Paper text:
PRMT5 uses substrate adaptors such as pICln, RIOK1, and COPR5 to recruit and methylate a wide range of substrates. Previous structural analysis revealed that PRMT5 forms a hetero-octamer with its obligate binding partner MEP50/WDR77. Moreover, the C-terminal catalytic domain of PRMT5 preferentially recognizes and methylates glycine- and arginine-rich motifs.
The N-terminal TIM barrel of PRMT5 binds to WDR77 and facilitates oligomerization with other PRMT5 protomers. The TIM barrel also engages substrate adaptors of PRMT5 through their PRMT5 binding motif (PBM) peptide. The structure shows that binding of the pICln PBM to PRMT5 is driven by several types of interaction - the phenylalanine of the pICln PBM forms a pi-pi stacking interaction with Y286 of PRMT5. There also exists significant charge complementarity between the positively charged PRMT5 PBM binding groove and the negatively charged pICln PBM peptide. Overall, we demonstrate that the PBM serves as the main attachment point between substrate adaptor and PRMT5 and provide a structural framework for the consensus GRG motif that PRMT5 preferentially methylates.
Author numbering:
A (entry chain K): 26 to 208, 212 to 243, 248 to 329
B (entry chain L): 225 to 234
C (entry chain J): 15 to 171, 181 to 293
């Protein structure tokens, strides 16, 4: 049986669906990861394509290609699992305890051979997956790192947000790699516009979503802290936002609400547009529900 | 145990 | 006289046994899951069914009273600027403190990371005046504020402030004897006067992150010749130590981090 609370739900180009879940209450606090060839079948453990247990909770995960998951563990570890050739087992590749606290999130740089992570130890670290070692570490923030987002357009650049009202852009290619970008209330989630080089959106704890250019336009969309943002795969994105109000809001390019849903009965924890039909959504929250929304577009 | 196991670093 | 301060506990029995085998004698664990945020006002989140925390039957009553030390959830911000966040933080803090008392934890850790904690003091005093004398309240506080320790990596962009934070908190709580300090040691140390003043406080525990340990020729972890003075002066105070972090010296076992700390104690000046 799988742990109740789903933590993340990430699609892959083929169409499979990877659900990382953890049991935040009860006797055991372990975690697990599941892979479904047919997303609709989930979360029934019997219909899962593959699955495995992990020693500690899965704070956040991310695909690293056609096979490979970079899992962030609350045990202060950054694990890398790799699926078998036939995609029947989730094998482990390496686990590194290089953080002194829970790892909030991890992202994969555009090149795909490197990754980044930030922890509640107010520290960020950049990893090389092939060398399975840490290249650089930065205690730039003065508080716990809340979110990290690698640029999908150009390599070696990423955004970081912390609980000290700082939004730092990074460029490791040059000395003094960190800058500061601002407009307020603490940032809580970040996303990069996929079809634009330097336009990115960030949410604040009050439920307001703002659109900024690296070289601001805001809207009140939620009544509580935004937990994530995921741009749509279309040629004209349809940014989707979820918050602790147990609500989903799909917005236009001008941050005007276009569709809303409340099928979840608890915290919505992740959403991801399907890569087979751009109209299908797929959201998971701690209510142990996986909901597919036919967003109008 | 090891000679200098607690010896001070430079 | 040492603790591990683990922020992840897959299974309580396993973690406790492993920590005991490493030479420690008490464990600093989170009573609630650090990431299990809870809502207390707005539906439907307030109706979250099922258990909210591991049952207390897992350990004998004596075990809770002596070996475990609670830690407040990291997502609780009583002094936040958002009213809903503030109320959620207050409710969560009260619930966690009440659960800690129910278990009978000898000590409980609370973090200080911001210059304003008036609401936290209010909540803590409201809790203290309930009538249970079971537990103390260690207040984590660093020597150097994070804002003064950042690596100066940003391009776009006074040491007593931490003691000012401690003083304001303890005066808000009316010098209650149940409030003690859990001084946290950073890589760099402040001037001699700051530490001398800091040693005049009721420090009950000291936190030594593994990140501050140097490396000896052989390879085992070791402290610098200036940290030794502070450790000795604390030992004179008979303060408890809490080795936190991970095995930065991966080659050696975590037990080493503590064995060295014993070498100082048995080599203390006569």
């Amino acid at each position: 049986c799988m742990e109740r609370q789903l933590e993340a739900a990430r699609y892959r180009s083929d169409g499979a669906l990877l659900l990382g879940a953890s049991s935040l209450s009860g006797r055991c606090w372990a975690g697990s990861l599941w892979l479904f060839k047919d997303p609709c079948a989930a979360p029934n453990e019997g219909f899962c394509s593959a699955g495995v247990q992990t020693e500690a909770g899965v704070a956040d995960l991310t695909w690293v290609g056609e096979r490979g998951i970079l899992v962030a563990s609350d045990s202060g570890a950054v694990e890398l699992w790799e699926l078998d050739e036939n995609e029947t087992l989730i094998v482990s590749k390496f686990c590194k305890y290089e953080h002194d606290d829970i790892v909030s999130t991890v992202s994969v740089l555009s090149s795909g051979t490197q990754a980044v992570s930030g922890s509640k130890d107010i520290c960020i670290k950049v990893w090389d997956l092939a060398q399975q070692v840490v290249l650089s570490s930065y205690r730039a923030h003065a508080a716990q790192v809340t979110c990290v987002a690698a640029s999908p357009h150009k390599d070696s650049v990423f955004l970081s947000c912390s609980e000290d009202n700082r939004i730092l852009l990074w460029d490791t290619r040059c000395p003094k790699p960190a800058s500061q970008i601002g407009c307020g209330y603490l940032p809580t989630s970040l996303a990069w516009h996929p079809q634009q080089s330097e336009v990115f959106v960030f949410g604040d704890e009050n439920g307001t979503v703002s659109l900024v250019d690296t070289k601001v336009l805001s809207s009140a969309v939620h009544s509580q802290c935004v937990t994530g943002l995921v741009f749509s795969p279309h040629s004209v994105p349809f940014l989707a936002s979820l918050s602790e109000d147990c609500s989903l809001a799909v917005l236009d390019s001008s941050l005007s609400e276009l569709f809303r849903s409340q099928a979840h009965r608890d915290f919505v924890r992740d959403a991801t547009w399907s890569p087979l039909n751009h109209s299908l959504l797929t959201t998971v929250g701690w209510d142990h529900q996986v909901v597919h929304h036919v967003v109008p577009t | 145990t090891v000679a200098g196991q607690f010896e001070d670093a430079d | 006289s040492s603790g591990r301060d683990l922020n992840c506990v897959p299974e309580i029995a396993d973690t406790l046994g492993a920590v005991a085998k490493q030479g420690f004698d008490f464990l600093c664990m989170p009573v609630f899951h650090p990431r299990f945020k809870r809502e207390f006002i707005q539906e439907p989140a307030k109706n979250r069914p099922g258990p909210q925390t591991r049952s207390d039957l897992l350990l004998s009553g004596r075990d809770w009273n002596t070996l475990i030390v609670g830690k407040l959830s990291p997502w609780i911000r009583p002094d936040s600027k958002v009213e809903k966040i503030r109320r959620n933080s207050e409710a969560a803090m009260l619930q966690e403190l009440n659960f800690g008392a129910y278990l009978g934890l000898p000590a409980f850790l609370l973090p200080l990371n911001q210059e304003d904690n008036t609401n936290l003091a209010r909540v803590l005093t409201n809790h203290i005046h309930t009538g249970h004398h079971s537990s103390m309240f260690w207040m984590r506080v660093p020597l150097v504020a994070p804002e003064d320790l950042r690596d100066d990596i940003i391009e776009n962009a006074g040491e007593e402030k931490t003691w000012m934070w401690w003083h304001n908190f303890r005066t808000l709580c009316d010098y209650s004897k149940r409030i003690a300090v859990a001084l946290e040691i950073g890589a760099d140390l402040p001037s001699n006067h700051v530490i001398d003043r800091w040693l005049g406080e009721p420090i009950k525990a000291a936190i030594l992150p593994t990140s501050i340990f140097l490396t000896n020729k052989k390879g085992f972890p070791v402290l610098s010749k200036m940290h030794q003075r502070l450790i000795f002066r604390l030992l004179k105070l008979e303060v408890q130590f809490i080795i936190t972090g991970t095995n930065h010296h991966s080659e050696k076992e975590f037990c080493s981090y503590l064995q060295y700390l014993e070498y100082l104690s048995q080599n203390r000046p006569p």
